[PDB]
Write a protein that binds this DNA or RNA. Structure first.
Length: 73
DNA sequence: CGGGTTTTTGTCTGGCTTCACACTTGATTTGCATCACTGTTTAAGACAGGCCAGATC
């Protein structure tokens, strides 16, 4: 952890200054879409969409009507 | 060869943070057992008498 901190502090300062100046310090959504598109580049739409969900926040499970629909159909 | 340059760690004392967590008590959920009910014979194959029928002395 400390290892990768050292390894990447240069990119850290780079991206933080550039994103803070560009969009007004909203590094959250900037880096969000950054990693989204970067991971989609290698055709990981599965992981990209589940990460879109995890950040969006929604429906980890199902509600009883849907489970009933499944075991009936 | 043993000595020296990387990655990797310890490391600072502050203020920050999210969140587990104390301590009841009943209203829920969830796990795991029970429960009552269903199918409605043979089919090949070995051995033994027993009866009869045809052979034989």
């Amino acid at each position: 952890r400390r290892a990768q901190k050292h390894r990447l502090r240069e990119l850290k300062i780079q991206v933080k200054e550039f994103a803070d100046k560009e969009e007004g310090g909203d590094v959250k959504a900037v880096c969000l879409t950054l990693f989204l598109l970067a991971l989609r580049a290698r055709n990981e739409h599965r992981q990209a969409d589940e990460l879109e969900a995890i950040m969006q926040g929604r429906g980890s499970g199902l509600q009883p009507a849907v489970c009933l629909a499944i075991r009936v159909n």
